[PDB]
């Protein structure tokens, strides 16, 4: 638990902000029914137009200030609903008080996608990032699901929150005019919780590899655990050795940082109707090892993110510990380590031995993720759970298959896959089912070991990796969410925290 250092100026912990300004926002919801007040700060109307370009903006809600003149149709026609196009204006109201008033365009379609709502929020955040306001209020002139409302809120909080921890003001009030604002009120605290789980995950991901390394990551998780009263355990090298976690130990052989295997457990208040284990890939930095990420495209500069799976698990723990779902036992697991080049590193060609006794021929040391997951997956399975769900920035191939938006889920059990897809729906974190194609299993037949780590022929890498992992779950329903492609936001230069909400929604729904 002390972090080793090369020089005294090496950080020895990950800075985390738990108490964010976003927690300092008092939120109230109101029925668009009763009309809208414009007493203070910034008022935005979310508007669309079926049959557009988009067409003009028309406000439909009645407003309790003669602001009404501004939002009359002569002036609003000058503005259109093209998705994400916004305008806001300052003006005085019935009190000669300063009000700011505007709109965000919501396209032509009256049902809105995960990604369109994102574009909506980004535009709204833009406005908040450049205006000092005590208050913002939001008027929904577009239909939205209870889930999507939350998503809007979550996304608003997350996108609005800025991470300043490595650099050497916010609204205090959010008001919302919806409609059946009773149906919705309850999404508010969930949103806020989901925001933090997400944001927290993002604090870990964004934490560079020199702050966030196996030891610091393990201390943080223990601290998180402590705050939620989750049971915690950090297996160090000696117990990982006793446990013969050789694939896992092999990957970290090269690091100055001892392997740390995080095991957090959320025992449930209820009757124990599902033991579930969430297993995240925690490579705190992936050099690729001796198969160094040197090829144009390999993105060595981003490989602090290769623990995104682990962070997503941890952020999910935050949400679970907080919202306190009933009837579920949950295990939060991650084989945390670093993939480094060294005299001590495992080599291409090494035959290593997983904790289940499977010998594995390493054909490429940058495929280290499935090696550590193999050992965690046996550990998970030994727990006697019903469901194992792992989540990993496992394969560059994701980017060529589903790309940066949707993650793929592979599995050995249809009904588990289905519970993941439905969590996808309600978490509004897009996941798509991908097959484990058994025809490819032959390409893992080592000549010398029991199994190859990688195929040399097949290029469907995400599929071979799933097939590899599948060899390490004997008897338990298991799904593997590969987030290599979706985890970092390339346009915005930051983690999405992808997966926290989806995993939480998953333990909440099933």
Binding site for Zn ion (CB under 5 A): 283, 286, 306, 366, 368-369
Q: What does the DSSP assignment read for 44-99?
A: EEEE--SS-SS-B----S-BS---TTTTSHHHHTTSB--TT-EEEEEEE-TTS-EE
Task: Tell me which residue has its CB nearest to Zn ion.
Answer: 366
**What value, to the nearest 5°, has the Cα angle with vertex 380 and ends 341 and 463?**
65
- Residue closer to its own copies (CB basis): 351 or 383: 351
Instruction: Choose the binding region for its own copies from 28-36, 266-274, 362-370, 416-424 (rule: CB under 8 A).
Output: 362-370
Does 344 interact with its own copies (rule: CB under 8 A)?
yes
Does 165 interact with its own copies (rule: CB under 8 A)?
yes
Does 111 interact with its own copies (rule: CB under 8 A)?
no
Residue 373 CA, distance from chain mean position: 19
**Residue 271 binding: pick among Zn ion, its own copies, none (C-beta 5-8 Å cut-off by kind):** none
Annotated catalytic residue, options 192, 370, 470, 501? 370
Instruction: In whole angstroms, give the CA distance from residue 81 to residue 103.
Output: 9
- CA-based nearest residue to 337, from 362, 372, 370, 290: 372
What 3 state SS string does 106-148 have? CCCCCCCCHHHHHHHHHHHHHHHHCCCCCEEEEEEECCCCHHH
CB of 14 to its own copies, least distance (A): 11
- For its own copies, the binding residues in 30-59 under the rule CB under 8 A are none
Per the annotation, binding residues are 281, 286, 293, 301, 303, 306, 366, 368
- Note if 293 is an active site residue: yes
CB of 124 to its own copies, least distance (A): 15
Neighbour-count burial of 242, counting CB atoms closer than 10 A to its CB (0-12 exposed, 13-18 middle, 19+ buried): exposed
What 3 state SS string does 454-501 have? CCCCCCCHHHHHHHHHHCCCCCCEEEEEECCCCCEECCCCEECCCCHH
- For its own copies, the binding residues in 415-474 under the rule CB under 8 A are 430, 432, 434-435, 437-440, 447-451, 457-464
- For its own copies, the binding residues in 227-256 under the rule CB under 8 A are 237, 241, 244-246, 249-250, 253-256
Do residues 397 and 462 touch, judged by C-beta distance below 8 A?
Answer: yes
106's tokens: 């919501």
* Max CA separation in the chain (angstroms): 83
Instruction: Choose the binding region for its own copies from 216-224, 227-235, 321-329, 489-497 (rule: CB under 8 A).
Output: 489-497
Candidates 13, 64, 108, 353: give the one binding its own copies (CB under 8 A). Answer: 353
Candidates 52, 87, 146, 425: give the one binding its own copies (CB under 8 A). Answer: 87
Residue 474 CA, distance from chain mean position: 28
Annotated catalytic residue, options 119, 253, 275, 293? 293
Does 475 interact with its own copies (rule: CB under 8 A)?
no
Alpha helices, DSSP H, located in 324-367: none
**Number of helical H runs and strand E runs in the chain:** 14, 19
Does 272 interact with its own copies (rule: CB under 8 A)?
no
Candidates 2, 9, 19, 271: give the one binding its own copies (CB under 8 A). Answer: 9
- For its own copies, the binding residues in 198-227 under the rule CB under 8 A are 206, 208-211
**Residue 283 binding: pick among Zn ion, its own copies, none (C-beta 5-8 Å cut-off by kind):** Zn ion
- Note if 150 is an active site residue: no
Does 99 interact with its own copies (rule: CB under 8 A)?
no
Tell me, by CB under 8 A, how many residues bind its own copies.
Answer: 116
Does 100 interact with its own copies (rule: CB under 8 A)?
yes
CA distances from 7 to 4, 12, 171 (A): 9, 11, 41
Candidates 19, 168, 271, 475: give the one binding its own copies (CB under 8 A). Answer: 168
Sign of CA dihedral 384, 385, 386, 391: negative
**Residue 400 binding: pick among Zn ion, its own copies, none (C-beta 5-8 Å cut-off by kind):** its own copies
CB of 337 to its own copies, least distance (A): 11
153's tokens: 């809120």
> Helix 308-323 crosses helix 214-228 at what angle (to 10 degrees)?
10
Candidates 106, 225, 310, 362: give the one binding its own copies (CB under 8 A). Answer: 362
Instruction: Choose the binding region for its own copies from 91-99, 273-281, 384-392, 409-417 (rule: CB under 8 A).
Output: 91-99
Does 66 interact with its own copies (rule: CB under 8 A)?
no
Does 324 interact with its own copies (rule: CB under 8 A)?
no
What 3 state SS string does 189-225 have? HHHHHHHHHHHHHHHHHHCCCCCCCHHHHHHHHHHHH
Which residues are tagged catalytic? 293, 370
């Amino acid at each position: 638990s002390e972090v080793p250092q090369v020089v005294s100026l090496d950080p020895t912990s990950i800075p985390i902000e738990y108490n964010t300004p976003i927690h300092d926002i008092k939120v109230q919801v109101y029925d668009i029914k009763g009309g809208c007040n414009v007493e203070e700060g910034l008022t935005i109307f979310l508007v669309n137009n079926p049959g557009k370009e988009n067409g003009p903006v028309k406000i439909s809600s009645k407003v309790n200030d003669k602001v009404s003149e501004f939002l009359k149709d002569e002036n609003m026609e000058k503005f259109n609903v093209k998705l994400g196009t916004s305008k806001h204006f300052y003006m005085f109201n019935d009190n000669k008080n300063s009000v700011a008033v505007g709109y965000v365009g919501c396209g032509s379609v009256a049902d809105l996608s995960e990604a369109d709502m994102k574009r909506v929020v980004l535009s709204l955040v833009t406005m908040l990032h450049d205006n000092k306001l005590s208050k913002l209020t939001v008027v929904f002139e577009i239909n939205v699901d209870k889930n999507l409302f939350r998503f809007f809120l979550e996304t608003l909080f997350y996108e609005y929150m800025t991470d300043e921890r490595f650099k050497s003001e916010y609204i205090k009030h959010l008001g919302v005019y919806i409609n059946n604002a009773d149906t919705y009120k309850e999404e508010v605290e969930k949103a806020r919780v989901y925001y933090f789980g997400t944001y927290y995950a993002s604090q870990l991901i964004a934490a560079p590899s020199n702050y966030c390394n196996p030891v610091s990551l393990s201390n943080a998780a223990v601290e998180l655990a402590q705050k939620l009263n989750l049971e915690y355990k950090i297996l160090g090298v000696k117990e990982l050795e006793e446990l013969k976690m050789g694939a896992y130990l092999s990957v970290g052989k090269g690091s100055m940082y001892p392997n740390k295997f995080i095991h957090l457990t959320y025992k449930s208040k209820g009757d124990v109707k599902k033991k579930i284990a969430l297993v995240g890939k925690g490579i705190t930095f992936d050099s690729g090892g001796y198969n160094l990420k040197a090829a144009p495209g390999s993105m060595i500069d981003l490989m602090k993110f290769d623990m995104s799976g682990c962070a997503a698990v941890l952020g999910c723990a935050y949400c679970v510990g907080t919202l306190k779902p009933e009837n579920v036992e949950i295990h939060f697991l991650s084989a945390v380590c670093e993939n480094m080049v060294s005299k001590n590193s495992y080599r291409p060609g090494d035959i290593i031995t997983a904790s289940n006794g499977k010998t594995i021929e390493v054909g490429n040391t940058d495929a280290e993720g499935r090696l550590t997951l193999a050992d965690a997956l046996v550990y998970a399975e030994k727990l006697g759970v019903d469901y194992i769900v792992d989540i990993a920035t496992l394969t560059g191939a994701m980017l060529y298959s589903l790309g940066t938006s949707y993650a793929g889920v592979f599995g050995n059990n249809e009904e588990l896959i289905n519970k993941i897809l439905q969590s996808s729906k309600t978490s509004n974190e897009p996941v798509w089912w991908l097959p484990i194609i058994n025809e490819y299993r032959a390409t893992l037949n080592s000549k010398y070991a029991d199994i190859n780590q990688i195929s040399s022929s097949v290029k469907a890498s995400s599929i071979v990796a799933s097939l590899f992992l599948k060899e390490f779950v004997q008897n338990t329903a298991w799904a593997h969410i590969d987030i290599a492609g979706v985890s970092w936001n390339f346009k915005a230069r930051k983690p999405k925290g992808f997966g926290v909400r989806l995993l939480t929604e998953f333990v909440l729904n099933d």
